[PDB]
Amino acid sequence: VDYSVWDHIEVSDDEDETHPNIDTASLFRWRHQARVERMEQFQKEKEELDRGCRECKRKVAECQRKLKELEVAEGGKAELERLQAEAQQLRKEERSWEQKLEEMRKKEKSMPWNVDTLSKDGFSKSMVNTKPEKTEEDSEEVREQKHKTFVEKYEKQIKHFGMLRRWDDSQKYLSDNVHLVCEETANYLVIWCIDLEVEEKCALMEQVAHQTIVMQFILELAKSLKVDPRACFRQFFTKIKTADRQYMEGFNDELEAFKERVRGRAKLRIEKA
Amino acid sequence: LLFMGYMTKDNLAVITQWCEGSSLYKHLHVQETKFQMFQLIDIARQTAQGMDYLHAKNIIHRDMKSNNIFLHEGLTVKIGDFGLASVLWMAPEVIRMQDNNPFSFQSDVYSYGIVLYELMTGELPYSHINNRDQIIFMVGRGYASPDLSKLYKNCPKAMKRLVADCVKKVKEERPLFPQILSSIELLQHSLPK
Amino acid sequence: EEVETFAFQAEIAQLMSLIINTFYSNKEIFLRELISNASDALDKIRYESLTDPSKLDSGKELKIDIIPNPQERTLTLVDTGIGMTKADLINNLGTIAKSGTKAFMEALQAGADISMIGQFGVGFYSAYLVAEKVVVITKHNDDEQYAWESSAGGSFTVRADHGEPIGRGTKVILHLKEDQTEYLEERRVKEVVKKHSQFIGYPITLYLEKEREKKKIKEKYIDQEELNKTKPIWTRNPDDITQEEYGEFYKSLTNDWEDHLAVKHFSVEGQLEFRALLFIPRRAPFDLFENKKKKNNIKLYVRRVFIMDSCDELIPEYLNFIRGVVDSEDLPLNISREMLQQSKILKVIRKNIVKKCLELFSELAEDKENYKKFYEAFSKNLKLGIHEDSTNRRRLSELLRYHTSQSGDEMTSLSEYVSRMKETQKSIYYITGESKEQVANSAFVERVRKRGFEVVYMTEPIDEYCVQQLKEFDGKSLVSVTKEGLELPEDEEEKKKMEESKAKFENLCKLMKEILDKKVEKVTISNRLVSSPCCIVTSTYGWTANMERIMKAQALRDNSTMGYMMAKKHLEINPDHPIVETLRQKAEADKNDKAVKDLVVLLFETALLSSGFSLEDPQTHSNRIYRMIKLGLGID
Amino acid sequence: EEVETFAFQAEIAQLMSLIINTFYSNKEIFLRELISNASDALDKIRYESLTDPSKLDSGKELKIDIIPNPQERTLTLVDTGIGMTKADLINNLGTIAKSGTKAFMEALQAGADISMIGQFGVGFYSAYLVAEKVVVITKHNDDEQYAWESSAGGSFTVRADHGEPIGRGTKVILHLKEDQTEYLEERRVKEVVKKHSQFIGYPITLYLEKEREKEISKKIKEKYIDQEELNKTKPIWTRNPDDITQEEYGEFYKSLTNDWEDHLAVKHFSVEGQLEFRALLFIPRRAPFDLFENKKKKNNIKLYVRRVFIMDSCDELIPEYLNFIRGVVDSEDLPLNISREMLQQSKILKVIRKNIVKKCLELFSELAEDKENYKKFYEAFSKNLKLGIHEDSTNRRRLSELLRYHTSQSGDEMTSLSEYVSRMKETQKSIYYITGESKEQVANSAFVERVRKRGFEVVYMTEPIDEYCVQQLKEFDGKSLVSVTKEGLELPEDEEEKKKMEESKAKFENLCKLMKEILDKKVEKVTISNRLVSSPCCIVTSTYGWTANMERIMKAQALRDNSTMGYMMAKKHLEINPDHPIVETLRQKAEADKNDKAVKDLVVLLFETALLSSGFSLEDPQTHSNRIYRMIKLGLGI
Ligand SMILES: Nc1ncnc2c1ncn2[C@@H]1O[C@H](COP(=O)(O)OP(=O)(O)OP(=O)(O)O)[C@@H](O)[C@H]1O
Ligand SMILES: Nc1ncnc2c1ncn2[C@@H]1O[C@H](COP(=O)(O)OP(=O)(O)OP(=O)(O)O)[C@@H](O)[C@H]1O
């Protein structure tokens, strides 16, 4: 409702405020040193004001004490009258020093903010994550169990990708559920496309095969970039949209080669059975 | 087969949003790169506006000279003081140290005027005297002023009055930047003449 | 005189028009505002419970439910907050620019243990940005159920609810217009709540019909809790948080399952107060320096509510790899609560964040292998910061690591180099090159490696920019071995050699200047080579051959002033090499010999290749090479 | 049933607090608001003049005056506008969201000829950002003047105004806060007016006293000076492009972007409909040195709505490669923010940018009709044009025709792709280009001799941006670009040369395999083809991998990922000229036996020289230098 305390801030290394003909690197110094020297003068004024306050307080304290002592002792009436005027002068000095104090307070109110006065440090704690690294590739142990768990839990998603044809929709839908991006997914896609051609569904095999071929180059390019495929798959369809003619023919020929391999493997499986 | 994959177009973006450039310095009078009226008037105008900028921000330079002035290939002068790289470039108020803080706007204008004199003469002020022991004496007395017999020929005479009234020691009548912009404006109008 | 004191009025119809149309620039913040209001209601009712638990005898759970419905084109937002009575239903939701949250907070001033979001009093009316009419059903513990309803016409109808009762809280139904039907999809609302109000302090629950029932049935509603799954970690005190919680938070923040290298947690207090959390990614993004990614790293939060993402005033560009969340208690916000009314508070936040980041980097230095990984990831950002921040260049300077002569293939800081530097020298010797082996053995390093001096290798083009500002270190100037006038601790025998060689080797050097007058502007003798006879050094002012190459091969570089900063080359002949001695012997016989100058030009071209310069016309070098090989094999 | 209708109300104090606090990010725009309102009053009175000129007896000029008074610390703003009566004073300046300008617009009476900048009714209260107490003095034609006054305390007073009289219009007085005193100085008001209200039709005249009075035959510096330098620029885009001459455009350009000379070319168009704006675009003669310094906070195109500044150029206003275009874009009816600093519907910028891009591309195409001016434009903006080729995927076809290069027969002048196509032989079906580092570097090279001897024209491309451009450009008028640096170059071939190549393979396959073994890792393939005449060996790159120039350009990039380059190598393929006597002189030497140190030495030397002549850079030049040095030693006799 009110923002009257955040209307005066002086940042020293203000990147946006500068001059084209003034060295920004060196301009950031005369602003900083000016801020520091202004703060130092302000602190000096504070400290001298405070000693002045206590010294005039002790002045008036001993002055009242001496006034009482002179009043108690007889014969010091003339000295008491002189101390009356001296005391009044001391009160004038004290009330003037309090005036200096409230003017100093007003100056501090008018003092623009800075990084050092806006906030003071609270607590900082730096933690360095020391955790084991590297991965393993094998057909057993956690990897096979990972295959089984992921195929059992997310059969619907991988099947719906198997029944997909559009690139942009595939990109968006995986971007919603990027967890599907993994080597195990590609392995099961290949195996179950093999199974589909074992069932002899040629059109369904091709529809599944294009989609299965999609992530093979994604995995290859992820290996090339040394970044997990979950972090580089989104751009792949941007590349295939802006793909050169040779990339188109390469995608087509890999698709055809994988189709022929799948057909041959399914024929061998049928003959064996 | 798996083939090679081609792919390409990974990060072939034009990441060249950066900059690099610097001419050299401004200490060309020793280098002896004498220039004409146009360049010196332009440099004086640009340094004037630059120093007025800090004068407005209440930032006092005081120690600004040929070694704290930087030229650049964009035909711009970065008067931004380098920080490290002297004598003979001060004012008598600084030398006497009457208040131990000569740091005032009039002192900065005095420094501006004497660097203008140095550049428009192409020579270091008080070149005839090269001994610090006597140089400190003169500036401690603060009476004499440099002559203007080594002016560069064929230029508007207005900056001769500008430097002459910039170097007088009376700080109360020393010219200030609000009229200094007018001075350089009439200088650049007087450039063709 | 006459004085007529009045009171300011407000045209309510025009005020509603302003709020609905020209007040908020993004129509999808209405959901954020409603979630904020529901969080305020929940905070109020939960605060009232600690004084007397009997308050919560209308439903113990505190939650927010979002119930889109495309069968009615309505989106329902139900919470179990405090609700609001008839007087509240009039004042709060009928008086524009009046907040019951502010009234509630300013009332206590002793139970300030809570911080509820809202001080303006117009946030609810942003609901009309997507819906023509809104009906509000609430039930306070003190009053009965009421049905607030309006269509932003200037009047609202309040009646006792004649429908299904609720235990407590509020029930906002948004009869959306046909233009905002995209807000009824799971993905859209999920995106909105994840972007703006995913860190609210209360569970947020969706409710959609997508559950397949076993086989043709799909009428089960999805009780999808995952809108506020991740909870604000920086709120909890760090001494109670291990690396596991930080790791889970970072993994959920990046939407990618990878760990984080290090985590910095700190806060400041005073007039400005913020609890900031900064993470160093384990690896670098593949598009860290792609400009199309703009700056989407550090997010500003106010009371666990998002305001603005990474801005150039929030964190400097070279420090855009470090990603985290910044949350503050008090800040001045725009009416839309999307920008700050004071620009320079962002700059102050940046000033503190940069200092804390540099302290984190300095802390990382102690761990050898971890700092090795961090350097191999972000040395480019470190050197870019050295170039950019003149104020922090000093702090970034000691974070550098380089291959050196005496370190094999391990990187050592400048502090280690100055530690191991011989007292006889006062300069840091560095070489700016292109490859590891290209600088490992080169004509400029022979003498230095012979005398035991160590030189710092700089194989990346980023150092070529960095070194222009890193002109000194610890009071010692940095000088390159590829520049003219290399200073070297000299010996009396060495200077005697030099002075006799200048007189002895004047004829052939002036001969080189005569034959090569427009290509080489100085030929002299110095101490740089042992096993090589010629090298091309650059003047002290100009561009190193590598520097010139980098400038020439930049994509967007102006060529008009490129010719200004051409390096002025300097041939350097190693007198101890037999080639130059025999050449001088041949020249002494005659200065007009064909072979003498056609060998001089070949030597100059080969040295130019050895010095990293690019040949103006390599075809001349190639064709002279084949002509000389023809005469070598004697086939004319 | 039990319905009970109420009426919406408001909290006036809180609403004032919101208006003062949470709308305007910059405290300086109070000046913009007040000047806009004064211009609104001037527009109202000017329109009323067209129906009745007898209501202008009190004041005839239409002027806006600012008179800072630092001694009193008040910044007045006088105007001879329409003024306000008692009812208008208490309604418009007393009611939030009540804007009498909108109501006046409603009473247009089939006379829609003026553009009235006011819709909200909150603009006036911006003065409380910097002023603690606002005093307003207005005088209508048919009413006595009244002295409106407030301090945003929720209550305002109206006075009979027995003070100084004014003929017409209003006079707002801002009693600035004790700290917001920086807005009295000439510099700040000048900057604010130039930034926001520089294009107001009515003359805004700043007033200040710093004149040095003449003294001749003392030291007087107190004399109010009238300045109109802050409104000298006049909107010309509001006129038709037919009656404006070139010198007017040049004057406006030098007054707009401060450039010494005039413009190179101008575009002045407008589109009418649901989205109406008049766009004026210039082309600077010389591009600034920091044009591509992208940390400059782009401000080239200034979006004006109803002659007042709204926002600087954003990424969506104009594409990056057109950042050199200087000018203004002024519209009439766009939804503004409550702060009047941006547009509510930001998706309309996606239409403005499309229209501007299309019209500026049409401007560029039309400008390519006079040789001298187009050459001057190209010399300074070829980098931008090729950047556009690289970036835009919708104007690439249109943008391609505006590209110039040196060719094999273009001499020292640049010629277009269309002209080369016109001079293209029917036997060839490709465009031949070379990507090197210099004109002379590619003028004579191992890849061009054979082609230049035959009947094809080659296109020289030397600037580093050319490679970025040509990676996106894949065809031109149905003719595909082919680089001479890349392997598998296709030329029209007769049967005689065909069988000559067949015998050449049958004779040199042993060479191919043997120096393939010699260059085990340094070279992938060794073959022979018609690319060389007087050069024995050249090395070409792969079909999709980066060429040598692209490799060098990427390895020179300051901010690049040194993990992606490693697999994106150039598959170097050595190519031999079988007619050169060198490659057959060692043919017999290797035929006698496979293992000879001499043949390996010459093979390595030739490979290194071809690498240097192919534009590649040596991994370690010291080895080449040392072997050259030893060879010179042996030749000289030492
Ligand atoms: N669901 C709700 N439950 C309880 N109180 C509510 C609810 N929605 C609105 N209110 C009341 O309405 C008042 C004003 O509503 P509004 O959301 O506009 O203000 P606000 O919460 O202060 O937010 P803002 O600061 O964004 O304007 C609030 O202070 C609150 O008391
Ligand atoms: N200086 C002035 N001269 C004449 N009329 C004025 C002046 N200042 C305000 N008004 C009157 O005040 C009313 C509008 O005031 P205000 O500036 O707050 O609104 P607005 O300009 O329509 O809104 P906004 O600028 O926020 O779009 C109109 O009746 C207008 O004539």
Side-chain angles (χ1 to χ4, degrees), chain D residues 79-132:
Chain D
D79 159 42
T80 41
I82 185 190
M84 291 174 288
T85 63
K86 179 55 67 59
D88 290 333
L89 199 32
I90 63 154
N91 293 347
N92 305 327
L93 309 205
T95 309
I96 292 164
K98 181 45 75 184
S99 80
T101 305
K102 166 193 214 73
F104 181 85
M105 288 215 318
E106 311 313 293
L108 73 93
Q109 316 302 112
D113 74 306
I114 46 156
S115 198
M116 272 325 307
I117 178 51
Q119 309 319 297
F120 295 161
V122 315
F124 177 95
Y125 314 106
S126 284
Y128 295 108
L129 281 151
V130 316
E132 74 188 340

Side-chain angles (χ1 to χ4, degrees), chain A residues 17-23 26 29-31 34 216-217 220-221 239 242-243 246-247 250 253-254 257 261, chain B residues 1-10 46-47 49-50 53-54 57 59 61 77-83:
Chain A
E17 167 266 331
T18 185
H19 206 228
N21 90 10
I22 288 276
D23 192 48
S26 197
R29 298 199 231 110
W30 323 302
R31 274 214 299 255
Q216 283 173 44
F217 313 100
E220 285 158 48
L221 192 156
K239 345 196 181 203
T242 60
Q246 202 184 355
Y247 200 9
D253 74 29
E254 196 144 334
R261 287 173 276 189
Chain B
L1 297 191
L2 220 72
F3 316 92
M4 291 85 58
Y6 329 118
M7 325 146 298
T8 75
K9 71 178 108 48
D10 304 302
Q46 207 194 84
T47 287
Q49 72 197 116
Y53 182 126
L54 319 89
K57 303 288 155 302
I59 299 288
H61 259 208
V77 51
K78 304 319 184 95
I79 78 164
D81 293 355
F82 182 73

Side-chain angles (χ1 to χ4, degrees), chain C residues 4 10 202 321 346 472 535 553 581 611:
Chain C
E4 295 96 297
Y202 295 126
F321 67 94
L346 278 205
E472 73 192 6
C535 92
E581 178 72 40
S611 296

